[PDB]
Amino acid sequence: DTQVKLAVVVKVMGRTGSRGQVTQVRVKFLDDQNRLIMRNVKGPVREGDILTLLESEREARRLR
Amino acid sequence: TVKDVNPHEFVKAYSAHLKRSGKMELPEWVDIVKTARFKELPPSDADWYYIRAASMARKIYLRQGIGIGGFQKIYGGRQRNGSRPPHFCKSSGAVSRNILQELQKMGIIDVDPKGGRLITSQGRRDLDQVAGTVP
Amino acid sequence: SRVCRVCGNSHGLIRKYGLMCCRQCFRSNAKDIGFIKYR
Amino acid sequence: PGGDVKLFNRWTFEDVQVSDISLNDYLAVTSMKHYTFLPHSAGRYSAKRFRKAQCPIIERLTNSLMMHGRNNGKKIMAVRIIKHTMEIIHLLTDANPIQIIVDAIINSGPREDATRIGSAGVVRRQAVDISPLRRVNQAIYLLTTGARESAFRNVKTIAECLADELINAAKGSSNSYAIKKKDEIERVAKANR
Amino acid sequence: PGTVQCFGRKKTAVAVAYCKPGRGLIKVNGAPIELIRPEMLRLKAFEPILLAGRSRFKDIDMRIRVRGGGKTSQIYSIRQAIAKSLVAYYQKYVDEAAKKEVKEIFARYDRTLLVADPRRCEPKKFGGRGARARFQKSYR
Amino acid sequence: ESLVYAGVMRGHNDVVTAIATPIDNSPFIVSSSRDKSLLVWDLTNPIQATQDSSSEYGVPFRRLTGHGHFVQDVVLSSDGQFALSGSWDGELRLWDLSTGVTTRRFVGHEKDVLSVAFSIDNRQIVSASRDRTIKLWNTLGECKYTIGGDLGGGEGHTGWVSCVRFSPNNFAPTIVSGSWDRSVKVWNLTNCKLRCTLDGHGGYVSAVAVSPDGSLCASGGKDGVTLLWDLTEGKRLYSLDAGSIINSLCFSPNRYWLCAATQDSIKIWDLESKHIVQDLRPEVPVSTKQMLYCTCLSWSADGSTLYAGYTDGTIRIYKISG
Amino acid sequence: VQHRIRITLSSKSVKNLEKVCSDLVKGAKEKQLKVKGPVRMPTKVLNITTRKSPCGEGTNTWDRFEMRVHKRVIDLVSSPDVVKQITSITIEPGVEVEVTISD
RNA sequence: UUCCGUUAACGAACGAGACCUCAGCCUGCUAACUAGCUAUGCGGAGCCAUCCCUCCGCAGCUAGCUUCUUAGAGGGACUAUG
Ligand SMILES: [Mg+2]
Ligand SMILES: [Mg+2]
Ligand SMILES: [Zn+2]
Question: What is the layout of strands, in order, in the sheet containing E61-67?
Fold first, then answer.
């Protein structure tokens, strides 16, 4: 099974996608405040938003 | 007085007044006329003349010197032209004139020099009397 | 039965305000008459 | 919680609890600055990014009712609709209808989506996260669209259709349009994870 | 001596509140403020009175003449009329500190009970029926 | 002993440009600002030692709004309530502090006005201006004379006038004017001629002072060098050195002290000993960019308290010890 | 001996009108007359919108032409000869002077 | 092609900008019976009724009237301050 994990956008990196509709941010896990990983988010997002992750493992790559 | 009562319940109260307060004549076309060129059916309520009277003596009581070609604009509205755009249309002058003439033939209003129609002192009196009796 | 005062043409006539000029003669003489292009 | 200003002078804004810490900053019911008598404030939002995170949720929901052209601009009707929806909601759950609305908004927001991005040289659709603000945006979109689609060609009034939609989404029961759409978007997203 | 006459403005509607030292009276165009009649936006006209309290109005009568605009714009103009009129009354007759009080209660709830909207209706430009919209374009 | 600190009051949004205090109606301070208001403060003298020594020296009482631009200088009536204020809109106004309404209005200064001052009989009113002219007004706000013009027209300055004050000697009324042309003049109300030209500073002048007994003529300004002069006949006694710009100057009512606002702190010299004995710093030293100057100062009637109005609409009050 | 004289001024140019309008008021201020003015009436903007093109081809573009007309009124109490003495000074081009007598 | 700056270029001309119109703020100025608000008088109508109180009408040598309306002169914003 999977458990929904909760993360915080700590810095926002850029705008990926063909049409720039996706942002790339670095998130930080609230339970383990040592695991910082890259994710892609759809929709407006600033520094400090809390992102819900259905799975935690998937980690984006630079300029994905 | 009249401005301290909601104008819907007041018109209901007054249109019940003219009913049980004696009488007035009523034309022999009241059941068939539409009250406006743009209307589809005659007024739905059989007691509409009195409503149209009670709503209308409040117009002269809050204003002064209103003719008939102004009441037609008061009670006019939107006319839909089928496939063409809708516009603004005026109501019928016959009912507008006849209700004022009847208010004259009861002494609620009177015709005004300089043109128009004005509320009478006694017509002011009963309107504030009935206003005193609305919840 | 209604022509341009400047050229006697029958189309695009401006009768507003009493001008009675056609839409092209009025443009050629607008500044002289006193019609300014502000906005 | 000394805040005695109440919606329509009926519904207390005290004791509304937002459970999701994720969207707690993007639902405007918890702080005193966001309490209102009425959901019709001629607010100058949309002027800046993230301003509408401050717009009261009840106003956002009301704003999303005035849709499909023959209803554009008709805000007083939508405010009356929300009033009756709320009276019905408390005439069903006997609970603070703000809490029911907020629970429905939280429960009806998708957390994943699948879009066509370009990886290493070839474009194809991958799954992505949803920001909290777009979660709230989509939640209101889904609930309002579901209610409007129920009310069309039906003797049920849009107020009652909306109330049923909101109570069902607050329950989380998979019978409202909002929940089924949420789960279908998230399934299309999972399939391409 | 208390009398101030303060206005409030919206799209085109303007309201003007004249103040006397009376008892509790608030009348818009001669009718009680209880009866401003789009009733869905009725708590909007009452926003200031419940924001301050009827008690803050125990010694003034307000005659508010409103004009122009439409129904919603007049309601918002009246809102601004009560708010700025109260601020001016406490400015000129009561106290400088207890007008700062009421100013802060009024301006923590909404900044446009005291500041009017500079938003106006943008003019229309040829090539479409609207400020921004254009006629639908066809190629073939 | 020395000056001590009690608190700071905040009633003006923009830079405070003048304070005036009464002698007969004591607990009524009035201060002007760049906000077109004109605030009047009431003094029960509270120090709320309940919330970290809660900071307020008093409670604002009344704003005289009505000027169309920055109010530059204000003064009070020497016998009653009235106040007179000058502003950038080219006007002078007479306010009545018992009701908060204006009572008179001195129209006629063709350009901006920078200084106002009353008189003993309160019939002799002076206005200094960016017009590069001085004008004398009666209590009725109508004209009787206007000194100015270029060399041919008369002896008026060529830059803007920046400040004017009276000589408080009763057998010889005069008026001293500091200018942006780097020149101080002394005039007479008898003939509106000049007694003397007190040719001093090398930079523009922004301040002139007359002794409470009318004996010596402190003037400050651009260079940071203050020059004291002789009221009897135009003689430069000695020079003092502040360093930075100078805006406001004042004398203690009875004690022999001269105070100055010099853009990094308030500097009080002594005239008993021509040497500084008191510097006064802003309480809050936050590292924001160049800190609030003090823009204006005034003593009370008894000299028991000095008021300083700064560039942030903050006014900090200074008492004495014993 | 004193009438109610109304002098009405119309123009297309604000400044040329206001120069004459101030001149009349001051010329009647030296005679210690009662001058109730100047009264300003709503500017009348005569507007004509015309197609730029003479031939109806291309983008349909319009130009809006406008004449602003300004209407001042001055009120006086005098005899018509004193006013005719006053309204005889040099008048700028484009200004209408149409003195009458009100009731 | 706005500017800083770099620099076999130096110094200039147009276009952009500036500019003009409208809208947005001004209880500050000038006023206004072809705009009005305020108070007072008389007139009506209500009413603890006699006054007071409320709502309209009407007339003026009421205004230390111009807030609302109109239109002129200006002011205001410069990214000014952090
Ligand atoms: Mg239609
Ligand atoms: Mg239906
Ligand atoms: Zn032609």
Answer: E5-9, E14-20, E61-67, E26-28, E31-32
